[PDB]
Amino acid sequence: PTVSDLECKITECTYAFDFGGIATVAYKSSKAGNCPIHSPSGVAVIKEN
């Protein structure tokens, strides 16, 4: 599925040794499916895969 028309919104976060950050994304799809997510930069780590 081609991914376009993205919008990422940060809800709430706080820096601690556990996962203390949550953000939301709005999106316009091409078709249903599953594909991964990743952060190439090292400033933050993504709990989800």
Partner: protein
Amino acid sequence: YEHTAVMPNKVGIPYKALVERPGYAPVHLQIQLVNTRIIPSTNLEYITC
């Protein structure tokens, strides 16, 4: 989790607080006085009639 504040002293008026615990839905609490019974320390001297 715990919460601290200051409440004005009055017998009838209730007090409504809304605790926040990040990463969780907020909860509100309601506390209301019923009495304030000052008690002194006393000793007898004598009686009369």
